[PDB]
Ligand binder design. Structure first.
Ligand SMILES: *[C@@H]1O[C@H](CO)[C@@H](O)[C@H](O)[C@H]1NC(C)=O
Lengths: 48, 50, 47
């Protein structure tokens, strides 16, 4: 996926969705907060 | 439903007709029902007061 | 190919989906160099 910036209060350690998919990770080094977003994908319609 | 479903394959194809066109159709039906009567549902319309 | 035919009639068809392929890898581990080979490669263990 793609790692973006997000600003929420994350005092609890490490990682989170309805489907329990992870939305943030605590970096083992340079401890900060990142966000995970799936790669852009979509259906293709072939008009002819 | 906001974005988790949209990020697990689940897509929502938009409806073919937008709300504005549906509103235009309803406005047309009202216009015919008011200024025409039941005629406009059977071909050409006729004008008759209310 | 999807229709398994030679003459497609008309309209709109959904063949497949496209996704962005991953570019590189991101390996991120904590920095520790400690060792723990406590397997005796002397004590006769115990019961
Ligand atoms: C491990 O990395 C962190 C990152 O800031 C650093 O502060 C720490 O000194 C490092 N530990 C080492 C090099 O033993």
């Amino acid at each position: 996926g793609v790692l973006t910036e997000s600003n929420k209060k994350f005092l609890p350690f490490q990682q989170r969705d309805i489907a329990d998919t992870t939305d943030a990770v605590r970096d083992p080094q340079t401890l900060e907060i990142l966000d995970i977003t799936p790669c852009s994908f979509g259906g293709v319609s072939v008009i002819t | 439903l906001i974005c988790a479903q949209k990020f697990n394959g689940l897509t929502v194809l938009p409806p073919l007709l937008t709300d504005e066109m549906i509103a235009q159709y309803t406005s047309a039906l009202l216009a015919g029902t008011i200024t025409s009567g039941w005629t406009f549902g059977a071909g050409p319309a006729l004008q008759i007061p209310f | 190919c999807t229709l398994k035919s030679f003459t497609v009639e008309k309209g709109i068809y959904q063949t497949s989906n496209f996704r962005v392929q991953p570019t590189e890898s991101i390996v991120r581990f904590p920095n520790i160099t400690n060792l723990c080979p406590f397997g005796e490669v002397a004590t006769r263990f115990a019961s």
